[PDB]
Symmetry: D2
Amino acid sequence: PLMVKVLDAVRGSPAINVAVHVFRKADTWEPFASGKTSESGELHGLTTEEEFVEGIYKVEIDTPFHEHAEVVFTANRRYTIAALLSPYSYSTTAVVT
Amino acid sequence: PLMVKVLDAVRGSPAINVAVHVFRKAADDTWEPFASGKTSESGELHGLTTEEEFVEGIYKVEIDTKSYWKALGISPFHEHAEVVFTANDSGPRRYTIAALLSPYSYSTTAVVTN
Amino acid sequence: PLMVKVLDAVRGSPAINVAVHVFRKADTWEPFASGKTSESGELHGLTTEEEFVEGIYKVEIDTPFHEHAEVVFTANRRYTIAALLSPYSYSTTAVVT
Amino acid sequence: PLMVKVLDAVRGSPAINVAVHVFRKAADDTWEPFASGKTSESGELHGLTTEEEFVEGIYKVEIDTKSYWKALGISPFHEHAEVVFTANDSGPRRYTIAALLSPYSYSTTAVVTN
């Protein structure tokens, strides 16, 4: 029900072996799921539909400048959270089907 | 030293009266409130901080986009647009966080000057 | 060797049934390939590796404001041209593997 | 009535001295040269046209990004960043084309004011 795809805007490639942390809003953040992006820049199998209940979720992407993406959304369909990384910028898109 | 500029990609206009919250990471890893405001008619927010108070650290900028879109009659995806970055670790710099907003997508760009 | 994916940033969905025209630089533009995006917002089978030779290509995406994406690049790997559409903005990303 | 602003997402800075070419579609569907210039130290380009000459029509803005990146020591994907749009079909408006550049990605946003 939830997938994450990370792309590298400098190289035009998947961002590989990037640590991704997913949190669910308790109201502090409690760890929900995590992994490292694959060769395709993807992270699948983070959760099941049974455990991916309604609530607020945060996707953190931990890769001369340090910045960090934090994607916060209400969920519950299938969700793809895409992020495109640059040294001084990122973009994120949600595809909900 | 710290400003925020927000554009609306649905209207092709500045995003006006968008709430922005800035936090700074404290030594014990909590987020302390640092500054807040709302964007002007030009989609800009100035006066968040002074050079004295904007010390080296890790800062989190949250742009309250859900409230913005809903007031426009759009049901958006994200709660906020958010970015975390390290500031002033090579001495004082001036930072503009430039955000481009769509209901299901956003970008945040740091424009850093010396 | 060449695929195109179109997304809708207002709806968080594939952009479906959007006409896409591909041109190759002759130096005017001559039609190289075209189609309409599928249910997944994708356009596959535009060309074969044999015919996708080195050169300059242009991908045109024809969907109170009218604007139009034109993505121009030198090719020749596999190329994914992604575009994300908004009423007054678009983004495009190239993933080359 | 027509300005261009360009940011560099690799350097987190304005994109300076980037060539920009604007074209207008003629009645017989050819593209006629309309205006050109280079961005300033602030990444901005003004003075492309006057209100008189910026009539209703379809305009194409090309930002010469390949030359820009290569001078920086980056091998980019695109030849240019390009956008085609209809201008002034509801009477005169002022347009800013705001571009955000990375080697393998860009966005172009029209900020339209009355």
